[PDB]
Design a protein around this ligand. Structure first.
Ligand SMILES: [Fe+3]
Ligand SMILES: [Fe+3]
Lengths: 361, 361
């Protein structure tokens, strides 16, 4: 099954995105939850899954981290189960992502799902990132204040009670708070952006690991000074320009970024097939009609001519086939065209499959 | 005692520095070695000292690292003892440095001293750095080739036999080779420069340790694209500009560099006094005529208004007193003027002394 977003994108972009929060009434028409509260909890029981439980009694809070052996000593009110990146683990929930590809893939994060009993929620906070909160079964009251991870109470600019299929969009910076009125499922479609710090330090590691930027400062026309202990401004400029020059070299930064943002912020369900596929086995499967499916949560992005998957750079002369890898979550032989006839390309595919990044049926 | 360099600096800079090697005949007139071969070897016996022994027999080489218990099983020919940063450990040798402050302090490294028996030396190599090799007692034949850490044999553009007080200058990149003809002391005054790699990775650590560059990429006018998996050039530009912007912020980079180049490339002889000095004790000493002496090898550099010593930033409103710290290896009360009357400044001095960076007599 799949989901249709009822929403005017150019307007939402013009007037809300990264600017102003809004509640989209029945954004999803006749919304059907892709996962039961039961399924969700059973999933948080597993260790590879980043979950959390938030409770408030007597005015004080209580976070407990997953996984979870028992699901009692728990009240009937005032707690919330929050599970990170469920699109990594449950094929149906990953479909909630697809209608947001009107926003660029590289900026999309994953999907957090929360389950709360009446009164349950996390209290007033703010996020560094864009979010869409989709209301599933039940009902929740959400408050959002103007812009200024706990914060002090705030006057609300939006105060609404979401009904199934409603979507609350919140830009980064706006404080929000939400709690359940009946037993509620919320699906947060989250976004990500790097800060300058993450950029500078990650690019440095690439430079360092790959032995680049190995040219030395040279001063054949070394300037005079009055005090030998001084470092002069022009000298400082020269050092700066070495750094600018390296950042601006056409290939290196592009190539590092690709390897950086193509990585996920949460653990993937990587399960290498045994025995490994032969490039022939891949060819046969495809031509027989089998469907090659991308692993949930696995980011695949194109920067110029290169394509990157979970850190790996992928190069191939078959531009349209390679495009298919990045745009379709489910691939068939037609998507590849005559690229399947190049054994170099089959080989490349087979590697990706053996790494666990795509799998059959 | 102290040393006088007989040499025309503007010409040497115009025509040789970072351009072309040259032998300066009797650069030091009536040269007296500041250290015996005995003293040198005894010093390499100590563990805090970076030494090395290079031998060749039968065509093959043999490096052994310090320190050294016994000084036999050693031939009469074909070996060399090389000791790193002797200016850190032997007050007299540190004076060989002073006449090179016609070149900027920040570019000067330390002083390596080698002792070789006839035939001893390291064979054909090249360095990434400028050097002046001063010939002490004895005689050595040095060869230098044109420019292109072992290398293949080379035709020589300079082939000379140095006599005491001669100085061989070699820019970075030029292959050289030298061996003893009689028992020879060589004093290498070494230089240093950073590469872009060292810059980018060190600045990143500063950004990271000090919690800077924490602004996030924002795209309120996020661009349209045909394939949602693409990252567009303008997006890449925006990311780059975040990095340029941070490097160019007036204070941060200046401040990091200061903390970086003010550090030594070899271990210092840091010996914190016990008990610590009181700011009064410092004041008294100075006014009584005692001489405050900078620890050997300790770099002290000024960048704009700030002054940096072995990593520490030093700020004080007494600009000329602070200047004295960077220009004089030996300080007296006069050097400080009325800054000694500010207890804030005495306090600052006392800290530096207790760290072991300066000491009395
Ligand atoms: Fe939130
Ligand atoms: Fe050398």
């Amino acid at each position: 099954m799949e989901y249709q977003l009822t929403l005017n994108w150019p307007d939402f972009l013009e007037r809300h995105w990264q600017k102003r929060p809004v509640v989209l009434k029945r954004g999803f028409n006749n919304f059907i939850d892709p996962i039961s509260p039961d399924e969700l909890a059973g999933l948080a029981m597993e260790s590879e899954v980043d979950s959390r439980l938030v409770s408030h009694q007597d005015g004080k809070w209580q976070v407990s981290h997953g996984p979870f052996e028992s699901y009692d000593h728990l009240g009937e009110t005032n707690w919330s189960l929050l599970v990170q990146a469920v699109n990594h683990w449950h094929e149906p929930t990953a479909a909630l992502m697809r209608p947001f590809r009107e926003l660029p893939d590289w900026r999309i994060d994953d999907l957090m799902i929360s389950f709360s009993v009446p009164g349950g929620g996390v209290g007033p906070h703010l996020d560094q990132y864009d979010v869409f909160i989709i209301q599933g079964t039940g009902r929740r009251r959400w408050r959002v204040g103007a812009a200024l991870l706990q914060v002090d109470p705030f006057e609300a600019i939006i105060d609404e009670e979401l009904e199934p299929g409603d979507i609350l969009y919140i830009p980064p910076g706006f404080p929000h708070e939400g709690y359940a009125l009946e037993n509620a499922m919320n699906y947060s479609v989250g976004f990500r952006a790097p800060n300058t710090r993450e950029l500078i330090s990650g690019f440095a590691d690439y430079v360092l690991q790959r032995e680049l930027g190995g040219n030395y400062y040279s001063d054949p026309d070394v300037p005079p000074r009055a005090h030998p202990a001084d470092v002069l401004p022009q000298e400082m400029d020269k050092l700066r320009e070495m750094m600018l020059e390296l950042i601006n070299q056409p290939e290196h930064f592009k190539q590092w970024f690709g390897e950086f943002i193509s990585q996920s912020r949460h653990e993937l369900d990587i399960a290498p097939p045994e025995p490994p596929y032969q490039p022939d086995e891949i060819y046969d499967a495809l031509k027989q009609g089998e469907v090659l499916v991308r692993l949930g949560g696995l980011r695949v992005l194109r920067i110029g001519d290169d394509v990157y998957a979970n850190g790996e750079k992928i190069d191939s002369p078959h531009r349209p086939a390679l495009d298919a890898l990045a745009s379709n979550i489910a691939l068939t032989a037609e998507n590849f065209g005559d690229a399947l006839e190049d054994p170099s390309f089959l080989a490349m595919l087979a590697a990706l499959v053996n790494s666990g990044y795509w799998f059959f049926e």
